[model samples]
Target: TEQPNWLMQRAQLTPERIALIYEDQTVTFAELFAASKRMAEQLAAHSVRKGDTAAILLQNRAEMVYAVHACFLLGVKAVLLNTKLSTHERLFQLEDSGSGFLLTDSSFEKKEYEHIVQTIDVDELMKEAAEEIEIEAYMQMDATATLMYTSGTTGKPKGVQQTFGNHYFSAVSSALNLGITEQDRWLIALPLFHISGLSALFKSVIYGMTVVLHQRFSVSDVLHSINRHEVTMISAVQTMLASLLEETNRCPESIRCILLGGGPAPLPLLEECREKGFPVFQSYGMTETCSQIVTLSPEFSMEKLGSAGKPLFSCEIKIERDGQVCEPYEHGEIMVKGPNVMKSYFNRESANEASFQNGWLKTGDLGYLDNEGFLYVLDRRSDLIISGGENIYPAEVESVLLSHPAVAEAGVSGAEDKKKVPHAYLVLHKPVSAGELTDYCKERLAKYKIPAKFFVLDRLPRNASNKLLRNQLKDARKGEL
Candidate 1:
């Protein structure tokens, strides 16, 4: 299937419409499209061509949005790199994606790397003479648009190939569920590398809605931006919402939608939203699904509290265990089938085969559908922790701990939402202080991946089959000495 370029089509249809409001500047659709064209030219000048993969390392900025569209216009797949990642982790994604070019700004220091042909500082590249390059007028729906890296049970990150069709369908599905309007302006405080923020950009061009962008999630700045931009929608996680509630009793009158996702939200957070009249819509999804595939609307905010609601208009959900579909309320693996689901993991043939059973994507998440057809998620995968809206695999951290000479066995688990921190339980070969172990983790893992506290135990929980029992480890308390 072929379709006109979304940015090009939007520019033609709504040239003067406000596309983005960032800081003190307002950009129109026509201006945004023109800027992307120039960025594409700059990329072409550096010998970047169509079909090449470009790794984008950037924080949330207007230029980041332009760079993404520039790659789309050039028919080059964009690989989003998280800025918060450690050099070791960041370099792994760059090499694994087989990226030909790195597009970034001056804020992030440049580093020498292997397998990359060139690294272009977007600001400097724009100053040079632009090369005339042909831009794609039509986009193939099946063509890969972006590669987002996500880790699984193995602790190795895999590149998820998010196709153009996946993005288009995701936007369409969300629009159908949450009606759109011309005056709608969504406040975006989430990271741009995440599907949550990236998909919002696509929705802006597709729906002709204005985006009020923030560099980071500062509660005060977000509140000011919302009232000033007349923001109608905001997307946040439980931690952010809780922070907002601490500052203010109620949201602005213009705010209509508060999309809460990332991990399980606490009951008290939802209750506070209800009492203060915040329209909280709980959702469930992962990077593989492009974003939210199921969302609980505000009407059922309290009625079906904690449920992620039904699948989107074009999506289907099922529960399966050992090749058999589960009955209502029977816990099993959550399977999702929809047009918005990713095509496959890039260069991961084994993962592709294992993740896709028939047409359904085995989410690895444990959940079940009730008699009323609402989804109630029990856990994210089997042993994954989400702290401050970032996914952390226990295996990944355990690997780091095992490398230490003093550590014999290590198991990690997340605390409750009240703390939202990861704790490490270890059986050590020798005496080691918590401070020293924390310092060791600081060198290998990202700040968010570091365990907040370390506990020494005689032995870790294990089953008769010799498998680590993470569920049992969860029963351990902080006071356990």
Candidate 2:
């Protein structure tokens, strides 16, 4: 459980190599190391020491990157707070993780939580970014490296503990799966607070490759960045790619992969990428997995259209039902066993007990594997609709609805009738009625798979991550929240 400090090792490996490209500026590995060391020293002066938990609540910027590296240098366990979370949600995490310091930028107006943790604006920390500081020479693999709270789609969110080992293995698993090259440069435009975004930055430093950071996602900004930076890979979701596709016919020839995350991608979107010749790798993961455990590369994107693909080199996934493992093609709760999985949910014994079994993590999502071992994720078990003794996965229905040319977005959830009936909420690109869409679904889906009722909306309710908030779909009647 011993390794050289990650950034320090990268700096030593290729001191002059470009480490990050943010806004109009770029930093070499050597400069990044020095900048982080200064921040680490500033934090240490404030009594931030080894084995401390610190919360980072900043938007996308080099400052956020420096803060993460600073934590690595000082051995402070980082709690990556989502910038999009409401004040109340942020407070819950700060209190739950027992973070001793809250590192933020100017956007936050209220600072009363300073009573709980020393609140320091990023600019204030950067004032000392030029100073010299001594830091840990090596990182302990078993040390808690990150504390990321879940999105709480099914229930109250809990803080997940990721050890240094989990992150190290995550990078290794990703590199093996994606087959990174020395010339590869990744585009990171997603919110840095999410694991989906943070993993790109972490992998960049680990692989000593370049990463282009975006302050925000603008479709044109993404295209320009990919072209200008000669980006070989980019991280994206269904919504982002859909918008990107609407704007352009092709990606730069150098583009190697689009690491899609957030949630299950609509099949229509994947097929679009297929025709465009972009290698879209549909992945399945969450806060607990640190990085993707299952990824379907472009090669299998067509043949295994909806399959989440196979597990990474460091992971294994299977389906379980009633405490027994299910056979191939059998739908059941998905269980993931892997080195990339988190060790525990911090301060939440019940959540940990509910999720982890022995060494495997019970994902609480319904899925199955093909006879050839490809993963097919259906939908979250809590979101599954059951009517007349039939099991219905909302993702399957949503995918089918998305295939309709008129439907821009679709969300499926259970509606109360004689029993819980499947219902679809759609945002259409063109004028369409419930009866018209119902007929379209009838062609491709089983009778039970068709939605009994439909709700057309201006837009679907999505979280900051751009994932459809199915539970909030009915709330659209009140208004999109």
Candidate 3:
């Protein structure tokens, strides 16, 4: 269950292949390996041991890519932090993961954790001289490689433990399904903190494919990059692709695959893409499933209009209701089993128990399979809202709102627009304006997680058992809109 470290193996196999293409720079596999090796030496000089977990706070950049590879070279588990997260949220994840060091770029604001974590700026670390240390030649397949946090029903983020085998198998499954070629160049404009982006880096090293990375997502920049780099594939959500369509309604022939994720796209958007002859592949995945477990290939986009497609090679999907497997077309909770699935939620025994059963991951999402075994998703992970490809759990936002003394009760739901942003409904104990609540939320939640609209009510709608009916809240917004 062990293999030569991917970075080391790639460098040896394809030393001169273009590994990454930043704005004006290009790094080959050998050069990337050397950079990561230097970074690992500096990390070791700072007393970062092999087994320690490092919290990496960085944007999408070449240095961020190198930082991730550095952790692999040193056998350190990386806890990826969302750059958009508030300081409190980042701190909570850092503390919960028991990170020994916080690795960040100089571009980011300095973070201090009161001696709990040693913060190291990679820019400064690179400047100082360090001794060469022994890099890991082989990677343990079962060892935890990265920790990605996902908001759970408990209103707290859980650290998902992704092993090397999980990521390796995910890339292998994707390659087998997508048919990877040596000439493939994948454009990565998404944030690297998300699995969607990080998986690209891993796949590049594993397949020796080229990567065109962007620090941020911009229509002009992406378009320019696509033309200049002749990118073969790109990943995006409907919101991004819709915005791109405004500039040019057609997908370039050079771009062969456009992996659309973060939930099923809108019908109108898909119709537009189909008219333009875009190779958009709708996919279903989460932090727990690495990158993508099920992807709707372009061949069936028209046939399966709302389908999320079949599982990738070596993955299985089943629907269950009342503890029994459902027949085809029966709506039930989606259960997935595959090597790509996370082993467990780190330090979360209860979540582990609830998430996994007999090696099948109990994905809280509701979906059904057709007679042909095509999956049609009805919901995303238990009321979780995905707005513009970013996740915003209602419980996470509601918990932040309830922290305010003036708030008596809080509920949140997704807007029914093309982009499903959050909207908050509250029952207040004291007089507090919507602007005040928004200002309060800005401090605790990510900008996207902060509700776009606030509605004050005498009381929230609850069922006979006293459970807040989020579906009712969702319906109320439709009437108001």
Candidate 4:
């Protein structure tokens, strides 16, 4: 399918509508489109071109948004690098993406990668709009629009190649599931580098709705914004939701939806949403799926407390066990097929082979579908702990631990003693003995499902998206037992 450039198209449709609101400022669609076009013109002066991968490294700010649309206008694939990653870590990504040009608004003064990649200061690039250049008037749906790196069981990060069509369909799919009203303003708190954050930007352009942007997650400011800007929805993880609940004196009635993901939310959290009238929608997707292919509406979320809901109209999900599709309520590996599904791991034929089988992406996630077709995610295949011929789901125990008053955060991982045993690591709100928490879990969990030991932590290692890094036990559990 051929279409006009996304931002330019949206600008043409809703030129005067408020497209984005950052700190103390706002940009209408026309303003955003013009700014992005200017940036794209300057970027071409620096030798950037269509189909070239322009590596983008920046903080979550209005400039980041401008940089992204600039990529769309220039018809380039944006290699979004996580700013929080170490220099060495980012260098690995820069090389792996095969990007020779780096566009950044932050400090690139280390004078590093000078020999390898040409670094262009995005702020300066904006200033260097000496001549107007022709931006792409057309876009191919199947063209690669982004390369986002996601690590799997091997800890070797693979770039997920997302096509323009994947993003467009994802936005359309979400809008269909959760109707987008003109008054709906979605708040963004996650990093723009992540798929969840990036897709929201796409949704805003596609829906012609306003976006309330935040530099970081702040419960006080988030609540203030909902009241001030009449923010109708927010993109949140369980941690952010918990903080919002704890910090706010009131849950504003204006807020219509909390699009919650980052793994299955605890039942207690869902109950709180139920009691407080905080409309929380549980969602399930990964980097490969362009985010939220399966999501529950606020109505369905209440009935199916922990379910990720049914797949979008554009997506399909099935469970496979022992080389066969499973019946309802039977746990197995989750497989998904959709246009929103990533085409391939960037330049990784072997990885692509492992990921896709028979035209379906074998999501390493384990889950089951109810007779009604709601998806209940168990755990990641690599994170599953088996002991004494019984399968143990760490997320179940972790959720129980999180329910306790003293536990601020909890993660369960396998401890091997020839066979895998469950070990729980926690970040506490206040001081609590490991035994106290252990007994707390013992009350809620079966003997076999209970974690053999509990460790108090300073913090758990998490990736850019704030998902727990279960494999990094050495760093995540360097704590007192």
Give the top-scoring candidate (lDDT). Answer: 3
lDDT (CA) per prediction: 0.85, 0.85, 0.86, 0.85
* Model 1, span 1-481: residue lDDT tens: 9888899999999999999899999999999999898999889888888999999999888899999999999999999987776677778888899899889878876755534547889888778777677789888999999999874433567898999999999999999989898779999999889899999999999899999999889999998888888999999987789898888877788899998887555566678888888898889988899999999997887788668998998999999989999999987889999999999988988888988999999988888899999998876576768887876777668867876889988888888666377888888888887778888999999999998877777777663213366757765534222
Model 1: number of backbone collisions: 0
Residue-wise C-alpha lDDT for candidate 4, range 1-481, written one tens digit per residue: 8888878889999899999999799999999998888888888788887878889888788888988898888888899988877778888999999997888765655357666688988776776645787888777898888999995544678999999899999999888888889999989988899888889899988889999999888888888888899999899988899888777555788888889987777667777777777888888999999998898877776689778998999799999987799999999999999989988999888878887888899988999999999999998888888865898887888889888888888888888867578888888888887778778877888888888877777788877545688867655445665
| RMSD to native, candidate 2 | 2.5
Query: Candidate 2, residues 1-481: lDDT per residue as tens digits?
Result: 7899888999999999899999799999999998888888888878887888899998899989999989989889999988777777788889989899999988875385777889988888778643456689888888888889887566778888888888889999999998989899998888888888888777977899999999888999888888888999989877788888888887668789898886766667777888888788889998899979999888888788678889999799989998899999999999998888988888888878888787999988898998999998887888878866888888888878888889888889887887588888888888776677878999989998898877778878765545578888876652211
- Residue pairs clashing in model 3 are none
What RMSD does each model have against the real structure? Answer: 9.9, 2.5, 10.0, 2.1
Q: What would the TM-scores of all predictions be? A: 0.82, 0.94, 0.82, 0.94
Model 3 scores a TM of 0.82
Candidate 2's displacement at residue 75, Å, is 1.5
* TM-score of candidate 4 versus the correct structure, residues matched by position: 0.94
lDDT of 3 at 270: 78
Ranking by lDDT: 3, 1, 2, 4
Per-residue lDDT of model 3, residues 1-481, tens digit only: 9999998999999999999999999999999999999999999999999899998998887888989999998999999998877678888999999999999976776655646788999889999898898899998999999999985433577899999999999999999889998779999998899899999999998999999999888999999999998999999976688887778868877899999987666566677888898888999988899999999988788889889999999999999987899999987889999999998999999888877889999888888999999998876466867786876666667767876879887888888667687888877788787777788988888787888877777777663223466866743432111
Of 3 and 4, which scores higher on lDDT?
3
Query: Candidate 3 regions off by >4 Å?
Result: 152-154, 384-481
